[PDB]
Design a protein around this ligand. Structure first.
Ligand SMILES: *[C@@H]1O[C@H](CO)[C@@H](O[C@@H]2O[C@H](CO)[C@@H](O)[C@H](O)[C@H]2NC(C)=O)[C@H](O)[C@H]1NC(C)=O
Ligand SMILES: *[C@@H]1O[C@H](CO)[C@@H](O[C@@H]2O[C@H](CO)[C@@H](O)[C@H](O)[C@H]2NC(C)=O)[C@H](O)[C@H]1NC(C)=O
Ligand SMILES: *[C@@H]1O[C@H](CO)[C@@H](O[C@@H]2O[C@H](CO)[C@@H](O)[C@H](O)[C@H]2NC(C)=O)[C@H](O)[C@H]1NC(C)=O
Ligand SMILES: *[C@@H]1O[C@H](CO)[C@@H](O[C@@H]2O[C@H](CO)[C@@H](O)[C@H](O)[C@H]2NC(C)=O)[C@H](O)[C@H]1NC(C)=O
Ligand SMILES: *[C@@H]1O[C@H](CO)[C@@H](O[C@@H]2O[C@H](CO)[C@@H](O)[C@H](O)[C@H]2NC(C)=O)[C@H](O)[C@H]1NC(C)=O
Ligand code: NAG
Ligand code: NAG
Ligand code: NAG
Ligand code: NAG
Ligand code: NAG
Ligand code: NAG
Ligand code: NAG
Ligand code: NAG
Ligand code: NAG
Ligand code: NAG
Ligand code: NAG
Ligand code: ZN
Ligand code: ZN
Lengths: 848, 860
């Protein structure tokens, strides 16, 4: 029987080089493998323990002597019983011939089908091994810490272009007709980043510093790829220069996989992407589409250094490389594509991370992983964005040049190595001398949530106090504290608060103070009574004495504290009274977000008139801006992003000029059979307005089912779901669940849109209750999809009756179903809504 | 101090003979000063007179005897729990002797509309006017005056009331003496009454006008607010007609010299049968031959018949205890339909009786049903008897007894029962004893107790084998087991044999199994003629098919009552699972040749229940498939309908049904034809004639637009026609704008633009259709405490709200949710009759879906 019994593999045997040959028939979903694993023992062992799942092994041989396999499916491991005691430092070669099936679950070595522009059934195969799927494709030591070289050999038919990490060495025609493609030996790399593609593609290539960058897409979609290649070159030159370590490989391939459930990964030389995420069109694709494609290439590019070159010893440190890439996603962009204004997106991404972090349901970023399912739990965007946030707090604290130095030093000292997060902190610790220890970053990582810094200005000294930001414990953080002050003197400095209480002596007496410049520090600031009123006043006099980043932080910070009671809700609306003099998109959108949250929460309770007073108040503040808005695309990215916001708010709440302009624009587009171009920044608005009439709805539906453009399709879906006809709404969720007119993938987005407004509110949660089993069958538990379905449907419930109902439903399923992340998070949200209403509903009547 | 009476019921020892009540009510202050002079007699020996009194502040209590002018002071005892007051007598009450008890008191005129209640209303001259009336049934008389508040304790009443010169004061008996007092007030005195029950005493102090007609000796009169005395012509005309019928049929002339009917100017006003002072809510008596519809004409005719039949059945022959309340209430409900077929044959009210009976049969076949005759002990148990179910089942038992025996034999036993027990208190069994004088004792009415004492009704399975008709009997119970369940079933049967030889008869299944010897072989057999019998009839496969085929050949070989009974039965059995749903739709495939209203509305009812159930679940193609199939049959009947008020009441009702269905579903013309009518009515600023039959159909069509909805909302708050106001409300609640629908419910609960009384009708209308199905149930859950504050726990309203919002749920997820909500309220509330029944209903729906939902795809 099997000898080793543990999740992780023994440290005795170590892989050096991998010789993998695969013959996959794409029409059928089978593949014949041949793995020659060249290892070296370090400890005296009689057996080799490594991973293997869906494999029917023909002959297993140790080297020439045929060995034997032992099985352990619980850990997904296999054992080879050696004829001799494997001696220390001795190289050994182990061959395994196997039979396996090409995956359908879009995981590991997967396969699918599609229809060409010529309407011909075409086959395609690809890989997605992160975190534990490499073992399904080939028997191997599937652990990141087990870096080795890879010689990959793929047998394929003529029509198909076979791809892999490294460049192709030789393509030889076999006697059966099939071509055997051989690939250059890989650099020292972990099993998970190993990739191989088999598909009928076309290319778009641009050479740089001998390294050939190419974009692989389906021949019918090789026209939209043009922007992506141009972007990749720019960012590759940026990264190679920033990190000061040249890109290792002689090729860099980015690939648009022709499926919507495609596995998008940072594969070393074979960057995978869902077809849609790279298709940019300079004439139609909006600012949302330019920023999205630009963000994705930059993310999977920063991974080539932070995740491929320098790899984590184990998954418990995944937040580091995913956090580092997400920071380079926003960093590199503000350096080379400065006009995009991608900081605004990071600022909003940060704001959301903070609300999900404030919850008792929150989890600390640095947490030890041992369980099989605990590894897939590390794949949440919360850890990635909090991780990215604390690298911004670090980068802003110590110089931009001091930060880069430690980055270059870490990548050099760890090139082709496996690390623990602390090794980046150590690389930082060499500040030219060792100033502060990295127990600071350990306060942030090791404990859940973030802090509330309480400022009190008394003359020339500002009394600072920190505490756990909780909604309702001895929590202590090491916080850098940036701050700007005002005979019109603009002074800014930084201070480290390591203790529960502190103070900052000022050079001169100042009128206003704003702690946390551009919110760069992952915290919420609460000023004392007269200090809130100081900024509130200044915002009304001249707000430009502060940045848009600084301004939107006060808007978010006042509106968060208003929920928790440290500030009354009247003060939140007293701050935003300055909006009549706001022209920069970042604060305007944060206000509109905040106000829309209060609106819907109120509306769902049925305070329809009070809720409308909230929107007539906000409209009266954004009236000039709303009136000044042009129904075009002529403007800077941030300015056309503002256009979309302002026109979506006024048209949603049917405010003066709006609806009629959109309705006129809609009727014209309809008469023209949808052939007459509409500005993209007004598209969704005009569509939403038009779907409010049976004729327009039936028209839009008919265009959604016909059109090519997925970006336009999404805008049509959002519109069709914004309708007030509950029968139309129900049918959408029904038809999407069956995959009738809409893919099951767009279902979550529908349920989220349906339940956002009064007609479909109860309907969406009813749908989640009645189709729970079908939903759980189609999307597994813990799935991103099932987590937004429960959040989308329940979030706007603000009654004890609703809380009892949500709780009762989730108990009646399973005890494992009630004790879930998304369930216990949703129930915590309804409770907080119940609380926000008891604190803040009373007053409202009298002042809105 | 120690009370001498621990029991609920008053002792038999002291019995009242005469009461002399003097009252001075100040309607502007809603307070009254009273004086009672009870002439009692002792049958047993006692030191304490135990009677009833609540809300009273007693000043002086004095006691007299036999041949003594002098009044001895006596002390009162309190016991608020049973509403009782004990009088500690100075002299021992010696059996046989008569004594006079006198009590002077102060009290408040009721805030609510129970006992001696008061209210104000506005004039046609924008002036405020005060009014007072009574509602003593069941335990309220004790709130107005200290008395022996039990229906058995019967006495004569001398009521005297001091009122302001402008108010017209009324009571049971005609006025004897009105004498102007020195202060400018009038002291009205009414002649000594007949031997009557305490809950039947009445008096009204109101500024009203009259309309009178002297039928023989009796001056019948209708009293109303001066501004609405013109609309009581039909009311009187009808009352005079029915009074000739009842007196003649009962063979006992009305004992009073006058018969007064009054339209109380309040919506909540206590509507009852007080001898000679029949009270009714204004709304229920106002009728106009032009502006009013069919239901309106029927309602006012039925409500007059009911309160009138009660003068004999309830007033002249009252029941000893509240446990026999179903006897007189079912008898008045039976005369409500009987008299109307006798006089008002044109109304075709037999159709309304059939439907009521169909709806009774459904609620009575649930496990939550309780037998009509069950021991009443407390006030809660007394109020439990005030449900229309015991009345309607009772009405159905009397129809079955009238049909089994002759119409002439039913009349003999009736006249016999009244004559013998006139001015006496009765036990339920005395009616059956009078019937047992059948020419003598040919059969026992121990048959009737098989019906009264059991819950539900029987399922009768029939099997034809040559010239032998095999009968079986079992409790019609819906799945989800005691064998004491046996009924003495009167079996009416109709057939056809050689050359259309139409034969009919009766048999009595007093055993589990039986056999009927048929004359010859028959092409078909039909059991329970005109559904006179309170039961369901199932058939063996071939016998069901024989009737199904005959309905396709010539269905008029059967009555319209028989034809609607078969549509009910097949569909009911299809629920239980005794017949596949395929058979039910095969029977109704005969409907292409159906011209009678009764079968059409019943087909529609059963079909609208499936549609609504399928629609609340996602099955919206099946739901449309069902409606297009029904439409295909009824096409001509829909197409032949003229948008008018022309024709007989029956064919008028048909038009309303056929066109209401056709617009609801939007089938061809209907909608456009209604929308044309709506626009024209809206164009004339709502000052144009809409035919009452097509009115609601027209209103609903317009209400589907923001323009229409708003025009209608404006007309609701403005106009006076409460009948038309209700037609507008149904339409406003028929809207598909979730926001408009919520606003309606929220408003009626805060009493904003719609009064709180209409909330239950709103909640039910919102909930019936997809847009507001979840919205109405959510509203009931969220606003539950205000709902239960406003309408008490156990009221008809709260049952109505619970039924309406839930009945369309057919998922286990929905069933758990409903349970959980009520379980989280209280286990005292979760154990209510209406909640248990609500969950029972969902459970039965889930079972109906699991039985018939899957095969439905393949047909319709
Ligand atoms: C184990 O195998 C590796 C295979 O690469 C051997 O490494 C090579 O050693 C030769 C000298 O003997 C060098 O010229 C190569 O450059 C080495 N290659 C690499 C990538 O290391 C290694 O010597 C073997 N060890 C034993 C114990 O035999
Ligand atoms: C998968 O196996 C099938 C075996 O049928 C191969 O199909 C042949 O494909 C060529 C084109 O490359 C056609 O011209 C032949 O007609 C096909 N053969 C038959 C018998 O239909 C296919 O090439 C195999 N693919 C791989 C990658 O091995
Ligand atoms: C697809 O990729 C190939 C390289 O793999 C590109 O081939 C080069 O093409 C240029 C001209 O465009 C020649 O000067 C080079 O000598 C070619 N190199 C090789 C290795 O063949 C090809 O251009 C790419 N396709 C497109 C449309 O850009
Ligand atoms: C109720 O009591 C009031 C107050 O004593 C009486 O009010 C009088 O009403 C008449 C009209 O009905 C007026 O002309 C008088 O001026 C009122 N007087 C006062 C002082 O308000 C009323 O009459 C009493 N009613 C009864 C039935 O007793
Ligand atoms: C019912 O209305 C009639 C209307 O006429 C009243 O009758 C009049 O009564 C007065 C005495 O109150 C007589 O002097 C008149 O001669 C009667 N009118 C006629 C035409 O005969 C009658 O009093 C009213 N009754 C009640 C109690 O309201
Ligand atoms: C491959 O698929 C077939 C079904 O098509 C299945 O029976 C077989 O077990 C699969 N192979 C492996 C190794 O699981
Ligand atoms: C495993 O592979 C061999 C290849 O020769 C095949 O014949 C055999 O059927 C496979 N085993 C199973 C259990 O499918
Ligand atoms: C701040 O001022 C206080 C005296 O008010 C003094 O104790 C402290 O050392 C000062 N710190 C700095 C850094 O100026
Ligand atoms: C917003 O207005 C201020 C006014 O001082 C100006 O400095 C700023 O440039 C304006 N922003 C834009 C985008 O025009
Ligand atoms: C234009 O309208 C026709 C129907 O009249 C439709 O078939 C066609 O697809 C529409 N045009 C385009 C480019 O889709
Ligand atoms: C009702 O009558 C009593 C006297 O019997 C009195 O004390 C009480 O205040 C009255 N109720 C109200 C509501 O005034
Ligand atoms: C009525 O009210 C109170 C008792 O609630 C009492 O003080 C008052 O004197 C009573 N009135 C008479 C006339 O007895
Ligand atoms: C009065 O008393 C006698 C016995 O003393 C009794 O028989 C008689 O019935 C009573 N009077 C009336 C009118 O009931
Ligand atoms: C019916 O006929 C049979 C003869 O077949 C006879 O014995 C029986 O008594 C009859 N029963 C009735 C109820 O007529
Ligand atoms: C109904 O049925 C037929 C026509 O199909 C006819 O003989 C009969 O008289 C009609 N009944 C009425 C009341 O019109
Ligand atoms: C419509 O008629 C009502 C009276 O029935 C009146 O109050 C209203 O003002 C009328 N409107 C117009 C515009 O005449
Ligand atoms: Zn990543
Ligand atoms: Zn009655």
């Amino acid at each position: 029987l099997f000898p080793w019994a543990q999740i992780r593999l023994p440290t005795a045997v170590v892989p050096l080089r991998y010789e993998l040959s695969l013959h996959p028939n794409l029409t059928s979903m089978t593949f014949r493998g041949s793995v020659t694993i060249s290892v070296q023992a370090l400890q005296v062992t009689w057996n080799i323990i490594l991973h293997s799942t869906g494999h029917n092994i023909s002959r297993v041989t140790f080297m020439e002597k045929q060995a034997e396999i032992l099985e352990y499916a619980y850990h997904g491991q296999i054992a080879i019983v050696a004829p001799e005691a494997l001696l220390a430092g001795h190289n050994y070669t182990l061959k395994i011939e196997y039979s396996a099936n090409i995956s359908s679950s879009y995981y590991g070595f997967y396969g699918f089908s599609y229809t060409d522009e010529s309407n011909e059934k075409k086959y395609f195969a690809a890989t997605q091994f992160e975190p534990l799927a490499a073992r399904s494709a080939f028997p191997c030591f599937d652990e990141p810490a087990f870096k080795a070289t890879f010689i990959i050999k793929i047998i394929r038919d003529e029509q198909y272009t076979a791809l892999s990490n490294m460049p192709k060495k030789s393509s030889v025609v076999l006697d059966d007709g099939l071509v055997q493609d051989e690939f250059s030996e890989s650099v020292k790399m972990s099993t998970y980043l190993v990739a191989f593609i088999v598909g009928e593609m076309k290319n778009l290539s641009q050479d740089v510093n001998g390294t050939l960058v190419s974009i692989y897409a389906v021949p019918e979609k090789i026209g939209q790829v043009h922007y992506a290649l141009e972007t990749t070159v720019k960012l590759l030159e940026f990264f190679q220069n920033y990190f000061e370590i040249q890109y290792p490989l002689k090729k860099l391939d980015l690939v648009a996989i022709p499926d919507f459930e495609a596995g998008a990964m940072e594969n070393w030389g074979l960057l995978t992407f869902r077809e849609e995420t790279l298709l940019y069109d300079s004439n139609t694709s909006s600012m949302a589409d330019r920023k999205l494609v630009t963000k994705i290439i930059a993310h999977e590019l920063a991974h080539q250094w932070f995740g491929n070159l320098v790899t984590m010893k184990w998954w418990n440190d995944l937040w580091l490389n995913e956090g580092f890439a997400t920071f380079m996603e926003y960093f590199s962009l503000e350096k080379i594509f400065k006009e995009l204004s991608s900081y605004e997106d990071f600022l909003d991404a940060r704001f959301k991370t903070m609300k999900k972090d404030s919850l008792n349901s929150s989890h600390p970023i640095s947490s030890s992983v041992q369980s099989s399912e605990q590894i897939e739990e590390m794949f949440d965007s919360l850890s990635y964005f909090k991780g990215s946030s604390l690298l911004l707090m670090l980068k802003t604290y110590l110089s931009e040049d001091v930060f880069q130095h430690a980055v270059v030093l870490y990548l050099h000292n760890h090139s082709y190595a496996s690390i623990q997060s602390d090794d980046l902190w150590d690389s930082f610790n060499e500040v030219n001398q060792t100033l502060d220890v990295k127990r600071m970053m350990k306060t942030w990582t090791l404990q859940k949530g973030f802090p509330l810094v309480t400022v009190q200005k008394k003359g020339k000294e500002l009394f600072i106090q920190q505490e756990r930001f909780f909604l309702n414990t001895s929590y202590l953080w090491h916080i850098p504290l940036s701050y700007v002050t005002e005979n019109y003197s603009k002074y800014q400095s930084v201070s480290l608060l390591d203790k529960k209480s502190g103070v900052i002596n000022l050079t001169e007496e100042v009128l206003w103070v704003k702690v946390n410049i551009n919110m760069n520090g992952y915290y919420i600031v609460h000023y004392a009574d007269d200090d809130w009123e100081a900024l509130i006043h200044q915002l009304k006099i001249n707000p430009y004495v502060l940045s848009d980043k600084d301004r939107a932080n006060l808007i978010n910070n006042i509106f968060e504290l208003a929920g928790l009671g440290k500030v009354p809700l009247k003060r939140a609306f007293d701050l935003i009274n300055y909006l009549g003099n706001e022209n920069h998109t970042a604060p305007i959108t944060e206000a509109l977000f905040q106000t829309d949250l209060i609106y819907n929460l109120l509306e769902k309770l049925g305070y329809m008139d009070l809720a409308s007073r909230l929107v007539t108040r906000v409209f009266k503040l954004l009236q000039n801006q709303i009136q000044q808005q042009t129904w075009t695309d002529e403007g800077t990215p941030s300015m056309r992003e503002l256009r979309s916001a302002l026109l979506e708010f006024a048209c949603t709440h049917n405010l003066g000029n709006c609806s009629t302009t959109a309705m006129k624009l809609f009727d014209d587009w309809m008469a023209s059979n949808g052939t007459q171009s509409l500005p993209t920044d007004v598209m969704t608005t005009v569509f939403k307005v038009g779907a409010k009439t049976d004729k327009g709805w039936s028209f839009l539906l008919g265009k959604y089912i016909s059109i090519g453009s997925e970006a336009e399709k999404n805008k049509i879906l959002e519109a069709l779901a914004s309708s007030e006809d509950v029968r139309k709404l129900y049918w959408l969720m029904k038809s999407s669940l069956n995959g009738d007119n809409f893919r099951t993938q767009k279902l979550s987005f529908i349920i989220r849109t349906v339940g956002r407004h009064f007609p479909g509110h109860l309907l969406a949660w009813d749908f989640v209750k009645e189709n729970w089993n079908k939903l759980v069958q189609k999307f597994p538990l813990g799935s991103y999809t099932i987590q937004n379905i429960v959040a989308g449907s329940t979030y706007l419930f603000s009654t004890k009756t609703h809380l009892s109902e949500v709780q009762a439903f989730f108990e009646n399923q399973s005890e494992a179903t009630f004790r879930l992340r998304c369930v216990q998070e949703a129930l915590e949200v309804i409770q907080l809504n119940i609380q926000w209403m008891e604190k803040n509903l009373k007053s409202l009547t009298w002042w809105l």
